């Protein structure tokens, strides 16, 4: 249990058994996407990977191999990396499933280096946080290969497999790759050192900052600037010295990292000092990248109190600067993820019709993050939004960035077979490090598209799984005192009873938790009154 292997296996069984992903949506998107547009082709691969996250269903890729074989360079890297999101949590066969795409140590493996690098990144996504068996294999793969694309996938895979383990030996191996000054491997190395050292406040953050001043490669500076921001996770006042150094820097890319460092230092605290500094930089800086990030960073400071975020961001959404309006859309998307707040939806609606294509892209993604798992019976606006997404995807005259946003939004709405939600806070009100970090890396998809797969880390399964003394799942029934239509799955392509008696092992949305009651006289009684998650049952018979 403490290793997480049992909780992952039970989650994977739940996601496999309850997979209600609509393959017709993906078939429609595939037919509307022009075959020459590499961005829309990559967007459909990302949407497929998000829709089937942890369900092990690869049927769409198997049926469409002739369409996948048209992927070139980084689209082929992403195609292979997308298998890691689909097979997420499959710890035992994770190596055997990837074996055809892994670098075979003989001069006769006809793989493309993009597929081999993407397979190493896929292994890290499958074994995220649970790297004990694969850490050595990824280290040996990193040391054996001088190809930048394979090193890029190995670094990111190793950073995901070793997330928050503070392993010094993995740090020195990734640091040796950073000192090769390769523009693509160094961006991954920068992020991976940050992922390894999350929230340690190590003096090593000073070594990363020193190297960020020496390198001429903007990709390495950006990867290090985010990597430094990840080391500072959790640290509040201990971070202020390093944040003041990064924010007074001459380089706009280091100031951009300084805004993430402030966001990740003051995550979920709602601190007035941090909010005032972020709002100051959102207006005073000359760089639109710093301005966008300063507004986006408000979403990470304010997610503890999602009701305050629309009020603060409303004034920024009306700004003349499109980068600030984009940051405003994503700030609300991150803070209000899975809450369904009506104020947040009313603020995002105008931004979906913006003149600027990337503002529309941000608004569509943010709306999908807020509306994740919401039914048309709870809010009629979900039905209008799904028709709007379909319209944008079918239209030929729409901009490529707005289409990419609509495809990703459709993927996020139907994520994990409709059984996952984006959740920054645990039920215990602890910060989910993987979800905050996953969303902070995900927000950088403008510079590097393969970072889109980090959204998978922010997916929390919405399951009730009752377990016996032997850690097996018994069949038993429990009552929901709500109308079934509120917590139903959307219908496929073509007062009331309030005692929906579904099996205790079933999808339970956070809004449904208040209506769940155990039947007095059932064979199984919970040791603790918990309405969702893993609950141990006392057998009375």
């Amino acid at each position: 249990i403490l290793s997480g292997e049992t909780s992952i296996q039970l989650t994977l069984q739940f996601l496999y058994s309850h997979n209600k992903s609509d393959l017709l949506i993906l078939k429609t998107i595939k037919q509307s996407v022009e075959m020459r547009n590499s961005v829309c082709h990559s967007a459909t691969i990302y949407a497929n990977a998000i829709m089937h996250a942890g369900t092990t269903v690869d049927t769409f890729l198997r049926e469409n191999l002739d369409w996948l074989s048209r992927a070139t360079n980084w689209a082929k890297f992403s195609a292979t990396a997308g298998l890691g999101v689909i097979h997420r949590g499959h710890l035992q066969q994770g190596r055997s499933l990837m074996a055809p795409y892994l670098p075979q140590g003989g001069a006769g493996g006809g793989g493309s280096p993009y597929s081999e690098g993407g397979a190493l990144y896929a292994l890290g996504l499958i074994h995220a946080n649970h790297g004990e068996g694969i850490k050595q294999f990824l280290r040996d793969s990193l040391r054996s290969t001088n190809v930048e694309v394979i090193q890029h996938g190995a670094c990111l895979g190793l950073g995901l497999a070793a997330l928050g383990t503070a392993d010094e030996d993995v740090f020195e191996d990734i640091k040796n790759v950073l000192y090769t000054d390769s523009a693509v491997a160094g961006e991954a190395a920068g992020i991976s050192m940050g992922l390894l050292m999350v929230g340690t406040a190590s003096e090593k953050a000073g070594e990363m900052l020193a190297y960020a001043h020496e390198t001429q490669h903007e990709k390495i500076i950006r990867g290090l600037a985010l990597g430094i921001a990840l080391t500072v996770y959790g640290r509040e006042e201990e971070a202020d010295t390093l944040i003041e150094q990064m924010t007074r820097d001459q380089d706009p890319i280091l100031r951009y990292g300084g805004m993430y460092a402030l966001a990740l230092a003051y995550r979920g605290t709602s601190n007035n000092k941090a909010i005032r500094q972020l709002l100051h930089f959102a207006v005073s800086d000359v760089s639109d990248d710093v301005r966008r990030t300063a507004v986006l960073a408000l979403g990470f400071v304010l997610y503890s109190e999602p009701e305050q975020t629309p009020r603060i961001v409303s004034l920024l959404s009306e700004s003349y600067n499109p980068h600030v309006r984009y940051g405003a859309a994503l700030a609300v998307g991150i803070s209000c993820a899975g809450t369904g707040l009506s104020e947040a939806i009313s603020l995002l609606e105008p931004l979906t019709s913006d003149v600027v294509d990337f503002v529309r892209q941000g608004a569509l993604i943010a709306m999908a993050m807020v509306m994740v798992q919401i039914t048309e019976a709870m809010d009629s606006r979900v039905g209008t939004f799904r028709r709007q997404l379909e319209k944008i995807i079918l239209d030929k005259h729409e901009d490529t960035m707005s289409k990419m946003g609509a495809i990703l939004a459709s993927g996020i709405l139907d994520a994990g077979g409709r059984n996952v939600t984006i959740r920054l806070l645990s039920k215990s009100k602890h910060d989910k490090i993987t979800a905050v970090v996953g969303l902070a890396v995900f927000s950088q998809f403008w510079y590097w598209y393969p970072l889109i797969y980090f959204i998978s880390l922010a997916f929390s399964p919405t399951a009730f799984v009752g377990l016996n003394y032997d850690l097996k799942v018994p069949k038993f029934d429990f009552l929901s005192h709500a109308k079934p239509s509120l917590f139903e799955y959307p219908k496929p392509t073509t007062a009331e009873p309030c005692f929906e008696t579904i099996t205790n092992p079933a999808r339970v949305v956070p809004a449904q938790e208040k209506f769940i009651k155990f039947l007095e006289g059932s064979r199984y009684m919970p040791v603790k009154l918990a309405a969702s998650g893993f609950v141990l049952l006392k057998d009375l018979r």
Binding site: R36, N37, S38, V39, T72, N73, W74, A75, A183, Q216, H217, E218, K219, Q250, D357, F358, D399, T400, M401, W446, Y447, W448, Y449
Partner: protein, 287 residues
């Protein structure tokens, strides 16, 4: 290696001023030159300096790329301690916008043969106005890729789409034969200090007091103007009927607009009188 949209071009402030001045000099026709620097990486191209071209007597052609000239200039620049290698070339389209003609396109391949990463820049000296500089960079799209129906570049970054292209360029072959390059500006802090120093008025200029007689006569005239505007405005407020047409008022108002002139004149009168006040008396104290 596929050319990527995340590519960014840095042009020095000195380079910008050089292209702008040189273009203004030859605004009637088109003036061309070369940018000096290096290729920072596969995505980053930085530009430091340019030197203008002595142009042959043909105002519609750039066919006079003299190579003895470049060799001499490069050698002497090397003697400067500036061995920077030519990064690209610029030419001007006064009022014609940013775009590549058949002649420019031909020169572009002619130089691409030497270096596949050449950068062509177009500078509009005319539309480049106070506060907004009209300039763009372009490089050609390989015709073989176009005939294959493939996208000429891979886009991992959305920066290339930030600037909406000119419909002229869309008429002049944009994205069919060539593509645009997003432009940012690398600016040194010392350059900014000196630039701010430029607009700093002489600290004595506040000391230069206006002659009392002339200042008083301006006051007198402006006061009489306030009288005239006041009477006009009284008529305007009185003649105004219940159905006052705002559109007609905007088209034609009393004395252009008695209220607006009244406000501007009181503002200027106050400013002049009170600055004269400050001047005379801070002199009184300190002299």
């Amino acid at each position: 290696p596929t050319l990527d949209t995340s590519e960014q071009v840095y042009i020095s402030s000195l380079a910008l001023l050089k292209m702008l001045k040189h273009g203004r000099a030859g605004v009637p026709m088109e003036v061309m030159g070369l940018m000096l620097g290096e290729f920072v990486d596969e995505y980053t191209v930085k530009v430091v300096d340019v030197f203008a071209m002595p142009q042959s007597g043909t105002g519609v052609s750039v066919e006079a790329v003299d190579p003895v000239f470049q060799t001499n200039m490069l050698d002497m620049l090397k003697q400067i301690g500036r061995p920077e290698m030519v990064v690209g070339w610029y030419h001007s389209h006064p009022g014609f916008g940013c775009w590549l003609s058949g002649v420019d396109i031909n020169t572009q391949q002619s130089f691409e043969a030497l270096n596949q990463r050449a950068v062509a820049v177009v500078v509009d000296p005319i539309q480049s106005v106070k506060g907004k500089v009209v300039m763009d960079a372009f490089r050609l799209i390989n015709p073989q890729t176009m005939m294959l129906g493939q996208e000429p570049r891979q886009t991992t970054s959305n920066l290339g789409h930030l600037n909406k292209p000119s419909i002229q360029a869309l008429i002049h072959g944009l994205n069919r034969h060539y593509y645009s390059i997003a432009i940012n500006y690398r600016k040194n802090e010392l350059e900014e200090k000196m630039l701010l120093n430029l607009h700093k008025k002489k600290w004595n200029d506040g000391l230069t007091l206006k002659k009392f007689d002339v200042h008083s006569k301006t006051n007198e005239q402006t006061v009489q103007e306030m009288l005239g505007l006041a009477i006009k405005y009284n008529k305007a407020v009185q003649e105004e009927d219940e159905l006052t047409p705002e559109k007609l008022v905007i088209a034609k108002v009393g004395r252009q607009d008695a209220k607006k002139h009244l406000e501007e004149h009181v503002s200027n009168l106050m400013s002049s009188n009170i600055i004269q006040t400050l001047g005379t008396m801070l002199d009184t104290v300190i002299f």
